[model samples]
Target: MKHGILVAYKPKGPTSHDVVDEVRKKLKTRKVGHGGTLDPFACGVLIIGVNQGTRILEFYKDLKKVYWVKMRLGLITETFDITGEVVEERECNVTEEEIREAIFSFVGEYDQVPPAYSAKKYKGERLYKLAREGKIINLPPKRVKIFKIWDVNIEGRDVSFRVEVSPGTYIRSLCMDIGYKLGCGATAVELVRESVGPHTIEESLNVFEAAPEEIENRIIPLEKCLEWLPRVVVHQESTKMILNGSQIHLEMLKEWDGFKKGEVVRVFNEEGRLLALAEAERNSSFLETLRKHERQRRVLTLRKVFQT
Candidate 1:
């Protein structure tokens, strides 16, 4: 079996670890790992990497993600969701217009504080560990950019929002912040990740509904995994250098626009063999910079090529 990516639709009950365990059993291969960790209460696309595909995880880490979020009004839990202890409660009556107004702030960039009951680390311990002990951990807010928050619908005590956020932005925190601004208690009750990078929930296989035999059929080809990354194909000579752990010169690139010197380029061979990523060294001359030759006349070899 070749390396590939499995876009599994995780169910709410099973932890992300459980999903990996299932994958390990189904594949009967020890070389299995998942890309991002999804909370047990949340469910959505969890990309699983098998064999060499695990190495492809680095490019997928910072991919843009989408989420379906539901927020509760006037009730906040210790963990900021229904799973944690209820720390405080406030009585308030707010209209849909008010909630819409609060949601508008999330359309752009803002500083966001992580949920207290989160897996974030502090002093080499998960913040959740501290929270479980009834300890208050003060964490600095991180700057996060949100592309948009387009839809806002209120249903009884729950409000749903469709948010478009950058890689590290947390929709759970956004829900909590809405409650904070309204002078009431709020927490994220429901969350379903819709997509990560180019892969969407529609393409994901639901574990609960799908048969065990069909699981492996859901894996995506490894070559098609990094759709968002810029790619380059090298000739046979350059491919040989890549296979030998040598860093090829990118100054030979063609008419690529304003490609910086230190930019990371994915090196592939003519036969579509995925080569090692390389950095472009500074140009010695304009001719060398615009040469556009795939052949590597000189290569800086890494000593670890033979070891791996």
Candidate 2:
């Protein structure tokens, strides 16, 4: 089987690891890895990288996620979700306008506390493992950006909404904060991840019933896996040099934008083959100060070379 990316629909009920395991069995490739892991109870776009596709999984970890959420007020749960034990209760007397106010108030950059019952590891223990063992570890607040929240609908105590947030932000934690602000504890009733960065649920293949050949057909080529990256086409001579481990310089690039220092660019040969990924050593503005050494001054450092 070819090494590529599989945007999968992870249905609720199975752990993220299970999704990868299923792909392994179907694809007959033992080297399958997923970019992001959703909670067993939460489901949506799950990017699976087969073989070489796993090389770029690191990029997906930091990608922003969008979730379709349904939270209920007046009850705080142990894990902050419906799956957890109810630990506290309060009257849900707030109006729909108040609910919207409380939820939207979390917009912008805010310090968020991760849920106590999470897979975060500490002292040789998964935080959830420790929490279940009656030893809860409280971590300090981390700053996460809530880009926006929309499509909010409230029916009595339940609030259904959608949120786009920074990678580390916990939806369950958001429920707690909203409840905390409203003075009426809340718990997550549902969390359906709608997208992860450029990958959307619409593009995902149904893992439940799709045949192996169907899956193989939908596999995105390795070159297109990082499609979100900027392109940098190189000269024929430069391609040979890059394939031979020589560094990239301004003179080598056939196409590029205002090269920002340390920015990563996807390198392509004149033939349209993705050659490699390269990081700018310094800003392209340096072209002036060292005008004479455009070829000598190595600018881009090859991060990964796809072909010889």
Candidate 3:
């Protein structure tokens, strides 16, 4: 089975799931999956996984995301974005300094409430579906981090800014928070996801522009997909044991350092074939354990084995 990753530039109007369905149809395979979802109105890099590559989707969850947003102050929507019905409008008498200060205040970690008309699930029902039925539920606040907010430009009531945030961060909620702090209502009018982790919009392909065969050509190999994880090479003899679903001790590991506990690592054999994905169980330094100790230390616990 062919397995790899595809970075697609999802255009406006189609939901993220819609794009995944198209990919699945065009490629004539049902094994295709996506890393994240984008709302119908917003567009950007949508990571797609093909065949066995879908198993590695969890690894992409922690990657930082970047977005360029346009917010309209003095206006509010039910969804916190332009897609929803207008609910309130107010005067924007605040100065640019106030807006900048408010936005910069959210530079660090904070708990943000997901919008009411959002995809967040509440009691097994999607919040948006509930909102459509005029049944509103109090969505809990989620802890999200904002790394940076730069190039903030304020022109009249329209504020344009670029934000880099951790995964699961909602830009619509961020705009609403900024508006509340400025004493003016706000709604996200436009949003563009510029990048996800190391993959950017420039490297992505439009599903409409490329042919089905060409799209498959854009699939990044499984070996390349695992590049983000730290590498740990096992001995030739131990490779068979790893394939047999046996836990590898510290002495069996040929190369590993600077790895922390609970960090996921890519296990490879002598010929550089990916053997498995393992989690580090050691609490202390690998160098100290290898140098001072005579007996083997339990290092990596097998999480998923590629070879059977």
Candidate 4:
């Protein structure tokens, strides 16, 4: 069976899991999973892990994300989006200048409250199930960042904007907050993810129309897409230690481009095939002490071991 990471363009209405299930059904394998989740009412780039690819999903969590969202001011919904039942409405009189100011104000780290109608877990069950039971449990505000915001277009009471934010940010809540800041309510009318880390919608494949044979060609290389992860060429001496789940000293590596303290790194064998994923257990500055008292100290610890 072909095994590798891939990405899909999830259309609106189907859940992220729905896409994975469809891929599993079409591909005739149950070893499919996603690196991130998108709302049923939203569409965008979704990273998929096929067979062996599933093991690498852990390496791509919390990637920076970008989205384009449209909202209607003075509209309130149970789910914080147009897909939810309307709970309230009011007049919208905010100027375009005001809209720009409100959205941009969130251009840094801030505590954001996730919507009650979300997939977040509380105790054991999902919050969405509890929300539907009329037991709206508001989760504590989570600290998230908005890296950048683009063109705030306003048409009557409809507002459309784009933003690049840290993982875990809820754009639905952001739209509502901006609307409330403008003295009106709001709900997300349209949401589409444009990018996830280095992956973009432009390069994603269609999950709905994909075939198993075509999917093999569609699989993307982890090293190529995860270009940000520094690489280390492992010497032959380090292979056994890696396979044994042992610590690897920096000297065991033939060479490495760059590695920060405790940063996740991509490990490659002398033959150039990716062998494993590791993290720096010791700082590079300690290389001087390796021959001295720190000779017994560990450097790299394997996080994900792969045969290929």
Best by lDDT: 3
- Report backbone clashes per prediction: 0, 0, 0, 0
CA lDDT of every candidate: 0.69, 0.80, 0.82, 0.78
TM-score ranking, best first: 2, 4, 3, 1
- Distance from true location, Cα of 76 in model 4, Å: 1.1
lDDT of 4 by residue, 149-173 (tens): 9978888889898999988788998
Best by TM-score: 2
Q: What is the lDDT of candidate 3?
A: 0.82
**Tens-place lDDT digits, model 1, residues 187-245:** 88899998888888899987556676787777776656666545556565555655765
How well is each residue in 1-308 modelled by candidate 2, as lDDT tens digits? 57778899989889999998888888886588987678887889998988877787888877899999998899877788988877667787988788888888989987766665422345212453344344554555677899999999998888899999988788998887788788877889899999999889988887768898998888888768777767778887677778778888767777765668888988888888778888988776775555575445777899988762
- List runs of model 2 lying over 4 Å from the truth: 117-138, 285-295
C-alpha TM-score for every candidate: 0.80, 0.87, 0.86, 0.86
Q: Which 10 consecutive residues of model 2 have the lowest summed lDDT? A: 117-126
Between candidates 1 and 3, the one scoring higher on lDDT is 3
Error of 3 at 193 (Å): 0.8
Any runs in candidate 4 off by more than 4 Å, and if so which? Answer: 116-138, 222-225, 237-241, 288-297
